[PDB]
Amino acid sequence: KVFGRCELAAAMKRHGLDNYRGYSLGNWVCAAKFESNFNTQATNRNTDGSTDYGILQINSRWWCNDGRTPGSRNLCNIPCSALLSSDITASVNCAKKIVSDGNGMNAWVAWRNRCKGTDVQAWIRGCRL
């Protein structure tokens, strides 16, 4: 599923992301825009052989099991394919674990390079929230 910007913002708010660990909703929407273009079915393979999955491009090296990343962890306790669902619940629950991990949203390279220090509230402007 390809989300609309405001559709995703509302789904994220409902799942408890607005101000989760101090990151306002605009940050999560911005990160999703640049990670996956709001497409839950986004996959991208990394040089190390790991793969990123879903709307927040969560990586199989640490966070999920895809059966092909030798010597990886499954810290969110899910098959990576659960991250591609049109229901963002698994992606959101796993993102909460990631952002608590010490580096905050800097774990998402596109957030750090494209969202951090920008006016992220623009991403939720005009939405009925």
Q: Token match 């009925």: residue?
A: 128
* Min dist. Cβ of residue 111 to Cl ion (A): 11
Of the candidates 18, 35, 48, 119, the residue annotated as catalytic is 35
Query: How many beta carbons lie within 10 A of that of residue 83, not counting itself?
Result: 28
In Å, how far from its chain's centre is CA 107?
Answer: 10
Of the candidates 7, 52, 66, 87, the residue annotated as catalytic is 52
Residue 116 touching Cl ion (CB under 5 A): no
- Report in angstroms the alpha-carbon separations of 97 from 34, 49, 128: 20, 23, 28
Query: Binds 24, which of Na ion, Cl ion, none (CB < 5 to 8 A, cut-off by type)?
Result: Na ion
Mask 19-38, x = binds Na ion (CB under 5 A)? -----xxx------------
Of 34, 39, 104, 112, which lies in the binding site for Cl ion, with binding defined by CB under 5 A? 104
Reading phi first (left if > 0) and then psi (alpha if -120 to 50, else beta), residue 49 is in left
Question: What phi and psi values does residue 111 have, to the nearest 5 degrees?
Answer: -60, -50
Query: Binds 104, which of Cl ion, Na ion, none (CB < 5 to 8 A, cut-off by type)?
Result: Cl ion
Query: Binds 41, which of Na ion, Cl ion, none (CB < 5 to 8 A, cut-off by type)?
Result: none
